[PDB]
Amino acid sequence: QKENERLLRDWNDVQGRFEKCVSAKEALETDLYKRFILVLNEKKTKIRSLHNKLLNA
Amino acid sequence: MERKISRIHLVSEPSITHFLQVSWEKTLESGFVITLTDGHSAWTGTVSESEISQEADDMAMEKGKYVGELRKALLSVYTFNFSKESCYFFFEKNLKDVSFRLGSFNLEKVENPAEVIRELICYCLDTIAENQAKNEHLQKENERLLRDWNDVQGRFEKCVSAKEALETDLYKRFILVLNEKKTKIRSLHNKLLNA
Amino acid sequence: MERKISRIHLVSEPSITHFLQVSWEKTLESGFVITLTDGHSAWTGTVS
Amino acid sequence: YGDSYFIDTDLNQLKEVFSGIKNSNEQTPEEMASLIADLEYRYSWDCSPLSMFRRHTVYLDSYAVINDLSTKNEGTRLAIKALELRFHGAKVVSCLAEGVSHVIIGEDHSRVADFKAFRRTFKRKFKILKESWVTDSIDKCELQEENQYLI
């Protein structure tokens, strides 16, 4: 009886957590690239500018 | 109707086992039927609400501790004594160098040593068998629960590993692309302060 | 060692539940001890 | 590498570039964890749920003997808690050196006197927390206050 109660709880538990983790994993790759795009375009703006100024001088 | 059965001794016969059997309706507190046997002979008694509650009134022991001490004593120090003629049974709570009365029954025996022993054996063999059935069912059920739990473990380990690899892989590639931009910004920033 | 209690009715005795007890070393085939009882009396023997 | 310095670019464009970079792992896991911890600090990604334990180094008490890697207590719910801590950015470690910020305790307290005694040695001193700290922080998507979860 004790082992049945424990595993019925614990099964519901990892079932829910796992499916939450699968969904979060599937969002993670869009998230990181959205963050990287912006940072990397701002850096490109700084490189364009400094290299243009260096060319003119 | 409920019931319990238990092995005892008597100090009157120190060398040999006996069996008490205690059977009651709903609770031990409504009153009950009690039965002693050696393995050969039928002793019985009936002792009911009006006077079980009178025990914890004749005695200094209060109801909870006495019925509790009795289910410790009876339903498995205690000490048990009976004589077959008088049919007086008694038992007492033995303590470290003091000793005091717990209970006694003036029992009255019965005619059927066999029918008594038969019902005791049949109760055991049935109660045995029903529990082995339940033990199979819960065993099957909770093999399914463990079998499943272990598989979700496995998949979760795959997901955790895939998530770690996704982070370190993406960040290593970001770091390469980012750092080259930062290095060029530095080189140009310095080169531009100078020209 | 194994034993096994089993509850029976003799044809002779419709209303008495009897108990057959068998006791042996995993193969019954090796021979066994056997008891019958009715809660009043008991009987025994052996097979090889 | 073919991301254009002179143009600002999209998801599909950096995806392509990333798939064209070679495969390598020369960065130590410890170097890498701090590169990530620093980038998530600079750009404020550090409260992001799947990184919430990034700044936690964690020992998991399933070893019947503290620090002896032979004594693993497998098939316990502590194994799910190490999947969970790893999934949310914790540096889960199989040996308790000076580098540890947290020890996690399950049902079996038979080791807590010895964690508490060994922690008398330490210059920077780890917390000892109940399993439920990890659980409750993940469920609320946020680091829950550790003091209610002590020992």
Curated annotation (Swiss-Prot), chain A:
Residues 36-57 are annotated as: Interaction with LIG4. The lineage of its organism: Eukaryota, Metazoa, Chordata, Craniata, Vertebrata. Residues 1-21, 40-57 form a coiled coil. Changing residue 49 to D: In XRCC4-Asp mutant; phospho-mimetic mutant; abolished ability to bridge DNA. This is DNA repair protein XRCC4. Signal peptide: none annotated. Belongs to the XRCC4-XLF family. XRCC4 subfamily. Phosphorylations by PRKDC at the C-terminus of XRCC4 and NHEJ1/XLF are highly redundant and regulate ability of the XRCC4-NHEJ1/XLF subcomplex to bridge DNA. Phosphorylation by PRKDC does not prevent interaction with NHEJ1/XLF but disrupts ability to bridge DNA and promotes detachment from DNA. Changing residue 49 to A: In XRCC4-Ala mutant; abolished phosphorylation by PRKDC; does not affect ability to bridge DNA. It is found in: Nucleus; Chromosome. Changing residue 26 to A: Abolished DNA-binding. It is linked to Short stature, microcephaly, and endocrine dysfunction: A disease characterized by short stature and microcephaly apparent at birth, progressive postnatal growth failure, and endocrine dysfunction. In affected adults endocrine features include hypergonadotropic hypogonadism, multinodular goiter, and diabetes mellitus. Variable features observed in some patients are progressive ataxia, and lymphopenia or borderline leukopenia. The chain holds residues 145 to 201 of 336 of the full protein. The modification Phosphoserine is found at residue 49. Widely expressed.
Swiss-Prot record, chain C:
Phosphorylations by PRKDC at the C-terminus of XRCC4 and NHEJ1/XLF are highly redundant and regulate ability of the XRCC4-NHEJ1/XLF subcomplex to bridge DNA. Phosphorylation by PRKDC does not prevent interaction with NHEJ1/XLF but disrupts ability to bridge DNA and promotes detachment from DNA. Monoubiquitinated. Widely expressed. Changing residue 26 to E: Abolished interaction with NHEJ1/XLF. It comes from the Eukaryota. It is found in: Nucleus; Chromosome. Belongs to the XRCC4-XLF family. XRCC4 subfamily. It is linked to Short stature, microcephaly, and endocrine dysfunction: A disease characterized by short stature and microcephaly apparent at birth, progressive postnatal growth failure, and endocrine dysfunction. In affected adults endocrine features include hypergonadotropic hypogonadism, multinodular goiter, and diabetes mellitus. Variable features observed in some patients are progressive ataxia, and lymphopenia or borderline leukopenia. This is DNA repair protein XRCC4. It comes from Homo sapiens (Human). The lineage of its organism: Eukaryota, Metazoa, Chordata, Craniata, Vertebrata.
From Swiss-Prot, chain D:
Transmembrane segments: none annotated. Changing residue 14 to P: Found in a patient with microcephalic primordial dwarfism; uncertain significance. Coiled coil: none annotated. Testis, thymus, prostate and heart. It is found in: Nucleus. Residues 48-151 form the BRCT domain. Interacts with XRCC4; the LIG4-XRCC4 subcomplex has a 1:2 stoichiometry and XRCC4 is required for LIG4 stability. Component of the core long-range non-homologous end joining (NHEJ) complex (also named DNA-PK complex) composed of PRKDC, LIG4, XRCC4, XRCC6/Ku70, XRCC5/Ku86 and NHEJ1/XLF. Additional component of the NHEJ complex includes PAXX. Following autophosphorylation, PRKDC dissociates from DNA, leading to formation of the short-range NHEJ complex, composed of LIG4, XRCC4, XRCC6/Ku70, XRCC5/Ku86 and NHEJ1/XLF. Interacts with DCLRE1C; the interaction is direct. Interacts with APLF. DNA ligase involved in DNA non-homologous end joining (NHEJ); required for double-strand break (DSB) repair and V(D)J recombination. Catalyzes the NHEJ ligation step of the broken DNA during DSB repair by resealing the DNA breaks after the gap filling is completed. Joins single-strand breaks in a double-stranded polydeoxynucleotide in an ATP-dependent reaction. LIG4 is mechanistically flexible: it can ligate nicks as well as compatible DNA overhangs alone, while in the presence of XRCC4, it can ligate ends with 2-nucleotides (nt) microhomology and 1-nt gaps. Belongs to the ATP-dependent DNA ligase family. This is DNA ligase 4. The chain holds residues 761 to 911 of 911 of the full protein.
